[PDB]
From a paper:
To gain insight into caspase activity and regulation in coral, we expressed and characterized two caspases each from two species of Caribbean reef-building corals, Orbicella faveolata and [name]. Two proteins referred to as PaCasp7a and OfCasp3a based on sequences similarity to human caspases contain CARD motifs at the N terminus, an unusual combination that has not been observed in caspases-3 or -7 enzymes from higher eukaryotes, and indeed these proteins function as initiator caspases. Our functional characterization suggests that PaCasp7a and OfCasp3a may function similarly to caspase-2 because they exhibit DXXDase activity and contain an N-terminal CARD motif. We also report the first X-ray crystal structure of a coral caspase, that of PaCasp7a determined at 1.57 Å resolution, which reveals an N-terminal peptide bound near the active site that may serve as a regulatory exosite.
We attempted to crystalize all four of the coral caspases, and we were successful in obtaining diffraction quality crystals of PaCasp7a with an inhibitor (DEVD-CHO) bound in the active site. The crystals diffracted in the P212121 space group, and we determined the structure to high resolution at 1.57 Å. The data show that the PaCasp7a is very similar to human caspases, with a root mean square deviation of <1 Å compared with HsCasp3. In the active site, the carboxylate group of the P4 aspartate hydrogen bonds to Asn315 (CP-162) on active site loop 3 (L3), the backbone amide of Arg356 (GP9-02) on L4, and through water–hydrogen bonds to Trp321 (CP-168) (on L3) as well as the backbone carbonyl of Arg356 (GP9-02) (on L4). In general, the active site provides hydrophilic binding pockets for the P3 glutamate and P4 aspartate of the substrate, and a more hydrophobic binding pocket for the P2 valine side chain, similarly to that of HsCasp3. The structure of PaCasp7a with inhibitor bound shows that the insertion extends the loop compared with HsCasp3 and results in an “RYP” motif in L1 near the catalytic histidine. The structure of PaCasp7a also reveals a peptide bound on the protein surface near α-helices 1 and 4. The structure shows that amino acids in the N terminus of PaCasp7a (N′-AKLFSFGG-C′) (N′-PD-A025 to PD-G018-C′ in the common position numbering) compose the peptide, where the two phenylalanine side chains bind in a hydrophobic pocket between helices 1 and 4. The binding pocket on the protein is formed by five hydrophobic residues on the two helices (Leu187 (CP-031), Ala190 (CP-034), Leu191 (CP-035), Phe330 (CP-177), Ala334 (CP-181)) as well as Phe381 and Phe382 (CP-217 and CP-218) at the C terminus.
Residue numbers in the entry: 384 to 387
The structure:
């Protein structure tokens, strides 16, 4: 999970 990573933020855009």
């Amino acid at each position: 999970d990573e933020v855009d």
